[PDB]
């Protein structure tokens, strides 16, 4: 799923097929450095696009003076009783009115939806 | 250890003259070049530009044993001078000015 | 022994060097190195949990700088030299980089006062004049005109329309050097006036443009 | 324009070395004198602004310069000489300026010259008439904007208009496109869209990997670290993969320069000229605001990478597109940045014709004389023409110029005069039916009057600015850069591209100038310096967006500001001690300036106004309760300062229907008084 760079000329390693041992070989097209593939899959295309933005929001958003705050929902990892919540603010806005939270305690940065 | 328990004091001088201009020769760490493999080197200004401005051409271990091209940095003393600090047998420090910065890169 | 030959001694010695960044004002203080060139003392204190390096100015040079150590990782640095005898030498590899910074000795307001002092030459300004400066003088003969007069009076470019035989020799000689000369030079090489030159030339040769504006006369070999 | 912007133009001009011997000429210093009129017999006398109106004169001031001339013939002597205070031309003078005859006079003397003590000033007198310059709107420069043209081949587009610090007549613009997905073809259906670029001064489109290699960086591990800042992102790397496939066969520098060098304003017949031609166009016309020197080409690579990294974020749907009419992307051209633009094209035109007079006069080898070379009618009649007639161009250029500037002052009633010296103008057409450049935008709060606009065909095209709105004048970014480097900011060159994922890129005036690893302490250190005015002047804006993880700083001229009240934890910073000593300005010398320099008010730009939380009134919004917010950062002075000049004479304007307030503001301009 990732990418492979050549170890000699630092370029993009293409996948190739050899008719001897039935194993995927990654080859270069400037030099001919070789090696075998460990996962033996090339292409993947996610159309659902249901990526949870809990992996994209940053912990320093709790320094924003223009975001609402809450005393109801406390943090689990530290027990702080003050959070700051917001919406998806991104694409995939068909049914996007969820409410992600971020703890505001210094050096906690814990994030969670509900 | 002495890196934690070592204390010392040494004199610093900045000589108004030198017998040779001092430059920086920079390598990418990612290459991890073994300088021991450098039996010899040749070093000449690059010929594409056909002097002090000329990029360097470094030929190590023969004409094609190893070859790099060095490209001059935009500035070196535009706001702050760079100094080479060297330890002397008397323990005192000697400082040398950096004349230029050349960027060296590997060459297929 | 060759010009393009690089000494590898330093590298092969694994010679190490140190790299330090220094502010210009300090560096300007350093161009005034005390005596032949001594600028002070460097104090290196290392402890179990910390390490401190600083440099102190020579008392002469004066008339605490903590060091910030910088990483040299990602790029291998070495020092190479050019002697006053133009010999080339590699002194070493850089084992440390560092930056001299202020500490508890200055704040932003007086740093800006120092920046204004450095200003020295402000970018120029449009000043306000009083009344109006004189613009038109009363010169009689323009200075440029007076200079040409002496040249023309002293030397005349085209002189006597005389000595036809004498002129031909002067004329034939130029041709030996070149089959083709533009007309003006022909006029210039002799001093004979234009009309005589044309008639002698018309008499002894023909003139050819060669379709390149400038026409140079060529003698008839016949 | 007349203290700095005119001295820089003559000082930063190429000498005219010309030739045997050869000569030198260079200009050093500029002077001016008070406006003066030359009588019929050649006796000068200062003209007062009243005679200029009666006798149909023009109110202008003469202009001088110092020129030095050195002859270089290596004739065993370098003969230099100078002619100081040489006459050049005459510049109009705006009334009540620092260069007028009415500067700093008292009412007993203003009445003695038959002048009105209430006259505001700020207009020119040209052939008896009274002309006023209209501020023109303009799209902001040196920033990246991402749009989406839903009609053409492109699925996304970026733009960056660059100009190197007030020194270029044109402004080079560069696009970074991306082709459409639904390209009907059995070939590219599989690979996908290819990122393209349309450089200036070339005919054909160019793939981006090619123009990347023309700067060096031939490897594809080094290119793909200027464009992608973290290699744990497979979704983005998949999108840049089909960009390499078409630039795969051309894999070295010199052949790349030939590829772009083959299609220019002149197709190169030889090879070396193309490799020469492609060298400067990619060096002096590509992104001139970053650096124009032939060195420091690692910066032109990072910025071109950031321009492309930002184009992909707009395709994965991670950041929203830019708004065209968002009033934080606009700049205003006052009389300063307008006359300076017109003075360049007439100083070059004055040097272009000292050569033509020197060469004709030095081939005969006689000598040289410069007082006869300067055609003084170039600058005098050049400015006076375009101001008097309006078309912002040249006399033989009455077809290529922008019209509508410099109209005649309105003197029907005293509130029709003030409402003329404060007026903007958006340069879009006067009959286009597109509504989005005409409707009222949210960002006009407090900086443009919402009710005052004319009807007819010019609805929403001309606008008047509010009462306390203040336009900035400009400054040099030199003293902030020297402070930033000593506050632990890593430069771009001496850093590894893997230490860039968790750092906040620091921009200054449009140029990427480093990174930083602890921004929240940098920010509230930059601010408390501006509050008390040590290093940074009060008209710079400093934006920080937490999410996109960067920091912007601006110092240029054209941004529009307005003062607000600074609020600490939940209380105002304006204590009573400031009031009982502010009602005494008459014999205390304590005024507005001593109020800014004490950190209780602050000018807030439009861009900075998106990272702020305002309260509309102290006694009512800053009381602890079950409250709306609790982190108020600023407070308004009085919400009645959001109205213009002609709309703030209406009693109880918050009780009328809205179109009614628009009619009167366009009707109190024609009432007799
Ligand atoms: Zn390879
Ligand atoms: Zn927490």
UniProtKB/Swiss-Prot annotation, chain A:
A zinc finger (TFIIS-type) spans 71-113. A zinc finger (C4-type) spans 6-31. Disulfide bonds: none annotated. Zn(2+) 2 binds at residues 75, 78, 103, 108. Gene3D superfamilies: 2.20.25.10. InterPro entries: DNA-dir_RNA_pol-M_15_CS, Rpa12/Rpb9/Rpc10/TFS, Zn_ribbon_RPB9, Zn_ribbon_RPB9_C, Znf_TFIIS. It is found in: Nucleus, Nucleolus. One of its GO terms (molecular function) is zinc ion binding. The keyword Nucleus applies. Component of the RNA polymerase II (Pol II) complex consisting of 12 subunits. DNA-dependent RNA polymerase catalyzes the transcription of DNA into RNA using the four ribonucleoside triphosphates as substrates. Component of RNA polymerase II which synthesizes mRNA precursors and many functional non-coding RNAs. Pol II is the central component of the basal RNA polymerase II transcription machinery. It is composed of mobile elements that move relative to each other. RPB9 is part of the upper jaw surrounding the central large cleft and thought to grab the incoming DNA template. Belongs to the archaeal RpoM/eukaryotic RPA12/RPB9/RPC11 RNA polymerase family. This is DNA-directed RNA polymerase II subunit RPB9. It comes from Sus scrofa.
Curated annotation (Swiss-Prot), chain B:
Belongs to the TFIIF alpha subunit family. The chain holds residues 5 to 150 of 517 of the full protein. This is General transcription factor IIF subunit 1. It comes from Homo sapiens (Human). Heterodimer of an alpha and a beta subunit. Interacts with GTF2F2, CTDP1, TAF6/TAFII80 and URI1. Interacts with GTF2B (via C-terminus and preferentially via acetylated form); this interaction prevents binding of GTF2B to GTF2F2. TFIIF is a general transcription initiation factor that binds to RNA polymerase II and helps to recruit it to the initiation complex in collaboration with TFIIB. It promotes transcription elongation. It is found in: Nucleus. Phosphorylated on Ser and other residues by TAF1 and casein kinase II-like kinases. Induction: Up-regulated in response to enterovirus 71 (EV71) infection.
Swiss-Prot record, chain C:
It is found in: Nucleus. DNA binds at residues 211, 213. One of its GO terms (biological process) is transcription elongation by RNA polymerase II. InterPro entries: TFIIF_beta, TFIIF_beta_HTH, TFIIF_beta_N, TFIIF_interaction, WH-like_DNA-bd_sf, WH_DNA-bd_sf. Pfam families: TFIIF_beta, TFIIF_beta_N. The modification N6-acetyllysine is found at residues 21, 32, 121. Its main location: nucleus. The keyword Acetylation applies. TFIIF is a general transcription initiation factor that binds to RNA polymerase II and helps to recruit it to the initiation complex in collaboration with TFIIB. This is General transcription factor IIF subunit 2. Heterodimer of an alpha and a beta subunit. Interacts with HTATSF1 and GPBP1. Interacts with URI1. Interacts with GTF2B (via N-terminus); this interaction is inhibited in presence of GTF2F1. GO terms for cellular component: microtubule cytoskeleton; nucleoplasm; nucleus; transcription factor TFIIF complex. The modification Phosphoserine is found at residue 126. Keywords: Acetylation, DNA-binding, Nucleus, Phosphoprotein, Transcription, Transcription regulation. One of its GO terms (molecular function) is RNA polymerase II general transcription initiation factor activity. Belongs to the TFIIF beta subunit family. The modification N-acetylalanine is found at residue 1.
């Amino acid at each position: 799923v990732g990418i492979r760079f050549c170890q000699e000329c630092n370029n993009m390693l293409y996948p190739k097929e050899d008719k001897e041992n039935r194993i995927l070989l990654y080859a270069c097209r400037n030099c001919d450095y070789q090696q075998e593939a460990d996962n033996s899959c090339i292409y993947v295309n996610k159309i659902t696009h249901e990526v949870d933005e809990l992996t994209q929001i940053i912990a320093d958003v709790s320094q924003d003076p223009t975001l609402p705050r809450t005393e109801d929902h406390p943090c689990q990892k530290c027990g702080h009783k003050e959070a700051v919540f917001f919406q998806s603010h991104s694409a995939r806005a068909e049914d996007a009115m969820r409410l992600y939270y971020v703890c505001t305690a210094p050096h906690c940065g814990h994030r969670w939806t509900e | 250890g002495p890196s934690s328990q070592n204390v010392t004091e040494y004199v610093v001088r900045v000589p108004k003259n030198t017998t040779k201009k001092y430059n920086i020769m920079a390598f990418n760490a990612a290459d991890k070049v073994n300088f021991a493999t450098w039996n010899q080197a040749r070093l000449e200004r690059d010929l594409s530009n056909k002097p002090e401005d000329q990029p360097w051409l470094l030929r190590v271990n023969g004409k094609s044993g190893r070859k790099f091209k060095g490209i001059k940095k935009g500035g070196v003393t535009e706001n702050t001078s760079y100094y080479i600090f060297t330890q002397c047998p008397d323990g005192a420090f000697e400082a040398f000015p950096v004349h230029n910065w050349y960027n060296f890169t590997p060459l297929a | 022994a060759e010009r393009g030959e690089l000494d590898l001694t330093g590298a092969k010695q694994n010679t190490g060097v140190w790299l330090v960044k220094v502010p210009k004002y300090l560096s300007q203080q350093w161009a005034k190195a005390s005596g032949r060139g001594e600028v002070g003392k460097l104090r290196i204190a290392k402890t179990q949990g910390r390490t401190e390096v600083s440099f102190t100015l020579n008392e002469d040079l004066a008339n605490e700088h903590p060091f910030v150590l910088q990483s040299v990782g990602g790029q291998t640095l070495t020092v190479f030299t050019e002697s006053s005898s133009d010999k080339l030498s590699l002194e070493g590899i850089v084992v440390q980089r560092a930056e001299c910074r202020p500490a508890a000795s200055e704040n932003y307001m007086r740093l800006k006062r120092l920046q204004i002092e450095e200003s020295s030459k402000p970018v120029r300004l449009s000043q306000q004049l009083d009344k109006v400066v004189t613009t038109n003088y009363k010169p009689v003969a323009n200075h440029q005109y007076n200079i040409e007069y002496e040249r023309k009076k002293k030397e005349d470019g085209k002189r006597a329309r005389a000595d036809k035989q004498h002129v031909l020799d002067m004329l034939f000689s130029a041709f030996e050097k070149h089959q083709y000369y533009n007309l003006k030079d022909l006029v210039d090489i002799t001093k004979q006036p234009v009309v005589y030159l044309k008639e002698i030339l018309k008499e002894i040769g023909v003139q050819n443009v060669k379709g390149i504006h400038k026409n140079t006369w060529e003698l008839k070999p016949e | 324009f007349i203290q700095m912007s005119v001295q820089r133009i003559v000082e930063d001009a190429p000498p005219i070395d010309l030739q045997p011997p050869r000569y030198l000429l260079k200009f050093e210093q500029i002077y001016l004198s008070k406006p003066t009129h030359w009588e019929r017999d050649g006796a000068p006398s200062p003209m007062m602004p009243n005679e200029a109106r009666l006798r149909n004169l023009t109110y202008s001031a003469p202009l001088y310069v110092d020129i030095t001339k050195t002859v270089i013939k290596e004739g065993e002597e370098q003969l230099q000489t100078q002619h100081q205070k040489t006459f050049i031309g005459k510049i109009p003078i705006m009334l009540r300026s620092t260069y007028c005859l009415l500067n700093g006079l008292t009412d007993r003397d203003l009445c003695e010259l038959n002048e009105c003590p209430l006259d505001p000033g700020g207009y020119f007198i040209i052939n008896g008439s009274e002309k006023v310059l209209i501020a023109q709107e303009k799209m902001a420069t040196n920033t990246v904007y991402v749009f989406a043209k839903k009609d053409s081949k492109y699925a996304y587009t970026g733009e960056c208009r660059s100009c190197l610090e007030n020194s270029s007549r044109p402004t080079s613009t560069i696009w970074v496109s991306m082709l459409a997905r639904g390209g009907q073809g059995a070939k590219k259906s599989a690979i996908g869209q290819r990122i393209v670029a349309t450089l200036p001064y070339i005919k054909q489109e160019v793939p981006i990997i090619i123009v990347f290699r023309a700067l060096g960086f031939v490897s594809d591990r080094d290119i793909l670290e200027h464009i992608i800042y973290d290699f744990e992102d497979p979704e983005m790397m998949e999108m840049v993969k089909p960009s390499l496939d078409e630039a795969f066969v051309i894999q070295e520098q010199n052949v790349a320069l030939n590829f772009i060098g083959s299609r220019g304003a002149k197709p190169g017949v030889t090879k070396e000229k193309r490799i020469k031609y492609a060298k400067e166009v990619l060096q002096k016309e590509m992104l001139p605001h970053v650096g124009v020197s032939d060195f420091c080409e690692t910066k032109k690579a990072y910025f071109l990478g950031y321009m492309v990294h930002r184009l992909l974020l707009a395709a994965l749907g991670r950041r929203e597109l830019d708004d065209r009419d968002h009033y934080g992307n606009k700049r205003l051209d006052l009389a300063g940045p307008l006359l300076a633009f017109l003075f360049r094209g007439m100083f070059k035109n004055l040097l272009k014709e000292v050569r033509i007079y020197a060469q004709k006069f030095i081939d005969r080898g006689k000598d040289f004389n410069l007082e006869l070379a300067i055609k003084t009618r170039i600058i005098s009649d050049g400015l006076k023409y375009s101001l008097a007639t309006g078309n912002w161009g040249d006399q033989k250029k009455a077809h290529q110029a922008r019209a509508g500037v410099s109209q005649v002052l309105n003197r029907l009633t005293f509130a029709s005069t003030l409402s003329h010296l404060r007026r903007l103008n958006s340069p879009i057409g006067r009959d286009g039916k597109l509504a989005k450049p005409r409707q009222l935008h949210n960002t006009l709060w407090g900086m443009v009057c919402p009710a005052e606009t004319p009807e007819g065909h010019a609805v929403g095209l001309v606008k008047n600015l509010a009462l306390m709105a203040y336009i900035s004048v400009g400054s040099q970014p030199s003293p902030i850069l020297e402070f930033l480097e000593e506050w632990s900011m890593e430069n771009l060159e001496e850093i590894s591209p893997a230490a860039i994922a968790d750092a906040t890129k620091i921009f200054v005036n449009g140029c990427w100038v480093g990174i930083h690893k602890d921004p929240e302490q940098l920010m509230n250190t930059l601010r408390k310096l501006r509050r008390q005015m040590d290093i940074i002047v009060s008209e710079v804006s400093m934006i920080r967006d937490i999410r996109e993880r960067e920091i912007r700083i601006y110092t240029d001229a054209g941004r529009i500001c307005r003062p607000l009240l600074i609020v600490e934890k939940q209380k105002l910073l304006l204590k009573k001690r400031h009031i009982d000593q502010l009602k005494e300005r008459e014999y205390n010398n304590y005024s507005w300036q001593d109020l800014v320099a004490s950190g209780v008010v602050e000018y807030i730009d439009t861009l900075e106004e998106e990272t702020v939380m305002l309260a509309m009134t102290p006694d009512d919004l800053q009381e602890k309760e079950v409250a709306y917010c609790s982190t108020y950062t600023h407070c308004e002075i009085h919400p009645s300062m959001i109205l213009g000049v002609c709309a703030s004479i209406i009693p109880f304007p918050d009780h009328n229907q809205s179109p009614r307030n628009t009619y009167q503001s366009a009707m109190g301009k024609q009432a007799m008084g």
